[PDB]
Each structure stands twice: as C-alpha cells, then as structure tokens.
Design a protein around this ligand. Sequence first.
Ligand SMILES: CC(=O)N[C@H]1[C@H](O[C@H]2[C@@H](O)[C@@H](CO)O[C@H](O[C@@H]3[C@H](O)[C@@H](O)[C@H](O[C@H]4[C@H](O)[C@@H](O)[C@H](O)O[C@@H]4CO)O[C@@H]3CO)[C@@H]2O)O[C@H](CO)[C@H](O)[C@@H]1O
Ligand SMILES: [Ca+2]
Ligand SMILES: [Ca+2]
Ligand SMILES: [Ca+2]
Ligand SMILES: [Ca+2]
Ligand SMILES: [Cl-]
Lengths: 229, 229
Amino acid sequence: SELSFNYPNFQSVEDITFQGGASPRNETLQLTPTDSNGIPIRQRAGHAVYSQPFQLRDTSFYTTFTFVIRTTSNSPADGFAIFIAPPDFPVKRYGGYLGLFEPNTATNTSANKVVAVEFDTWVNTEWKEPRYRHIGIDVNSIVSVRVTRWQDKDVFSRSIATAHVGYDGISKILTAFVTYPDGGNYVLSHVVDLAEIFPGDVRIGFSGATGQYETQYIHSWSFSSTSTN
Amino acid sequence: SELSFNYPNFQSVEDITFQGGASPRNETLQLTPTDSNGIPIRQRAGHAVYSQPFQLRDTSFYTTFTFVIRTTSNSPADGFAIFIAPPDFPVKRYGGYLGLFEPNTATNTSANKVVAVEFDTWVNTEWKEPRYRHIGIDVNSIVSVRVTRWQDKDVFSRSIATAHVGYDGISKILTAFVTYPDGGNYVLSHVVDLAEIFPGDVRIGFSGATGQYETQYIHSWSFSSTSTN
Ligand SMILES: CC(=O)N[C@H]1[C@H](O[C@H]2[C@@H](O)[C@@H](CO)O[C@H](O[C@@H]3[C@H](O)[C@@H](O)[C@H](O[C@H]4[C@H](O)[C@@H](O)[C@H](O)O[C@@H]4CO)O[C@@H]3CO)[C@@H]2O)O[C@H](CO)[C@H](O)[C@@H]1O
Ligand SMILES: [Ca+2]
Ligand SMILES: [Ca+2]
Ligand SMILES: [Ca+2]
Ligand SMILES: [Ca+2]
Ligand SMILES: [Cl-]
C-alpha cells in the first residue's frame, strides 16, 4: 500500500507510538531510557514506531533516518534496529535480543515474524555473531542472515549518521546503505519476500536495547511506499 | 580492491578522464556538448570516467552523486547512466544507445560487458522499453533487466537530484536509490555477480547522449569500495 511520512526532527511525534523504555526527548526518538542524571539504564528495551499499519503486497518502499549512538564507555551494549513486524508486535527482551526476540526462541526462524536492519554494538557469544561490532539484516532470528563489519571509528564517532533502507517489491530485495560523514560507508542486501512473511498488515519502527553505557537516538525519519502495479 | 574518492563539486577535475563530447563546465561534469549559444548538439555521446581502475573480486562498493537534467523542450533525449566497464571501453553510439552500445549488438547480452544504472528520457521503439520515461538497471544490454517509471514531474524539475548506487559483493546485488527534493523516490535492485562479468580491472563513470534538447550534468560524486575479506 501507499504511505508517506516525513519527520525532519521530532518536535512533533504526532503519528509515533512509544513503547517500553523509548520516549521523545530533545527533538529525537530516545530508544532506551536514561536516569535523572542522564546515565543509561541497564537491561531496558524500547520501541518507537510509526503508528499506522500498511501492507506489503505489491509494494516497494524507501526510508531514510539519521541517528546517533551515545556511549559512556568503550564497552557499550546492545544497539538498535529498524524493523518491520505485525502491528501488535510488542517490545521484547532487553540485552542482545535488541527488543525484538526472547531467549527461548531467538534463533528459531519458525517462531518469529520480524525483519530488521540491526546496528549491533556488543558481540554476543550466546548465539552466532561475528567477532566484531556489525550491521546486519535479520529475518526471523537474532542470527543475521547478512552481516558486515561496523568500524569502531564510526561506532564511536559521535556523528549523526545516515541510513537508507529500501525494498524492491519486484525483485524481492531489501537493501541498507549506511553512511558516516567523513567516515565509513556500508552496503548490505538480501533477497527476501516480505509479502510472503507478512501477508497482512505491518508497522515499521525502531527498537533499541541495553545493555550498558549506551543510548540510541533517532534524529530524523522519512518514508515512502508505492505500488509495483 | 579498495578505492575511495570524493568530489564535493568539480571545481577540480583531477583524475577524471573525458571522452567524446563530455567536458568540465561551470564546476560540473557536462556529459554532452553544447554550442557556444548553449544549444545541445544533436547525436553526441560523452563519457566522464574516474581514471583509476579497481577490481571486483571480493568487493563491495557505495557511490553517490548529484545531478541535473537541463531540458529545453518537452521531448528531450536521451538520458545518461552511471556505468562500470572494462579497460579501454570506448564511447559508443549516441542517441538511445546512451553512449554504451552499438546498434547491431545493443540487445545481445553475449556481446557486451557493461553494467549501468540509466536515467532514460526518451522512449525507444527500436528495442523493448517501457512506454514512459524510466530509470533502469542494465546488464550487458540496452533492454534493462529491472526498470521503473520515472515521473515527468521529477524529469523536468530542474532539481539537483541524488542517486545512491551500491553493490553487495557477498549477496551479489546491485541497488540504486534515487531521490528528488520534495519529489519522487525510486528503488531498484538486481542480483548480478559482477566479478563473473568483470574478472580484471574496471572503471566507473558516466555516459550521456543526445538526442536533442537536453544536457546532463553531474554536480558532485563520491565512491568507496572495500574488501569483503
Ligand atoms: C535508435 C536511436 O538512437 N534512436 C534515436 C532517434 O534516432 C533517429 C533520428 O536520428 C532520425 C532523424 O529523425 O534518424 C533515425 O530514425 C529514422 C527515422 O527518422 C525515424 O523516423 C525512423 O523511426 C522508426 C523507428 O525506428 C521504428 O522503431 C518504428 O517502428 O518506426 C519508425 C518510423 O519508421 O527510424 C529511421 C531509422 O531507421 C534515427 O534512428 O532520435 C531520437 C530523437 O529524435 C532519439 O535520440 C532516439 O534514441
Ligand atoms: Ca548481531
Ligand atoms: Ca549483539
Ligand atoms: Ca531504457
Ligand atoms: Ca531510451
Ligand atoms: Cl561537435
């Protein structure tokens, strides 16, 4: 279906729903909470989602957002993701589950219905992940189907980074491009038929989780979807 | 292999090779020529190519550029493309061939070694094309493998538009995202193993062709490639 929205900043959150530990703060989407002294709270997850459902049958989309990862140590955890799931998909487990999964089924593709592009700041040994911080595409599992190294210089840059995420509904390909000013560029694509995974309605949004010593902020977001008829 | 470059404008055109009717003009890459009164010269092609070659085995890349199409009538022709080609790739036929193909082999994928993302302003009947202006991915043929409608409002906007083109060398997927300020967004992706097409050196660049009543300009361009090892 056709949907378009544009948030150059979040002084308005008119159509944004906050769940769990996420909240609007300082003109951004703050995905995990901080205490009254600004210290990141451990073991929390949050979602900030566009409130209106849409359909993926015969649809392509383009979305872009800007983000900042704020770290208070060299050992931040756990990251965030942009995700698509049914409209009643709730905030799930904190820590390395990224608010998207729970421990008993995190790696079980038959037990989840969620697709995401993750920005993963903490190497988990509890399941298979690369031995470095990484950006990945997740399809129904915390173990990414496509993963690439995310350079530490970029992770810790303090920069407003840009993501571009697109889905070509003809070729059935999901792509992310991630760029840092005067920094790295990242490209990841994967063939996945989203309409087959999601035959009904979906919502798109963000999920963040701690972890420790980290807060994730969304500064701007726009989206457009169009029919492939 | 690993290569990076950045032209925030083309005040300097150091490391750009011009062929055909392309030239530096007014701090941009002008892909097709104009006479001294500014009138587009019909039936001309031009290339502006980054001079340093790279290899595609075990490689991903990201490139972005801004562009303007100056039309001087309601029936401009023919467009332009960003393309990759092997060494010594010459300027080929003007008109609907876009500087990238010759007539008798333009539709034969066994007779070309060229991959492009084209911005096609003139509907040709000499080969199969959609019946509207379009953006396409071309693999070894002027008949695009993936094509989408390019809205006239964007074609004729005189806006500085943006293209992002990425290649994921693990999944073997080429993707283009094209955006217009306050206009359309476009997404196309295609599975293609570029290292199997191009086993040695390649260069990346732009090819434009007339046609009539059109000039194509590149305003800015950056590129990075990284090993997937
Ligand atoms: C292939 C190509 O690059 N086409 C470009 C086109 O080029 C034509 C133009 O140079 C004319 C000058 O008017 O000469 C040639 O075309 C001839 C006739 O002028 C043209 O009318 C004719 O058109 C036929 C068409 O090709 C068929 O597909 C159709 O079924 O029937 C038509 C009528 O006969 O073709 C002859 C040559 O065979 C050049 O081919 O120029 C335009 C802009 O005007 C644009 O650049 C095209 O990409
Ligand atoms: Ca991960
Ligand atoms: Ca992790
Ligand atoms: Ca075409
Ligand atoms: Ca054409
Ligand atoms: Cl000339």
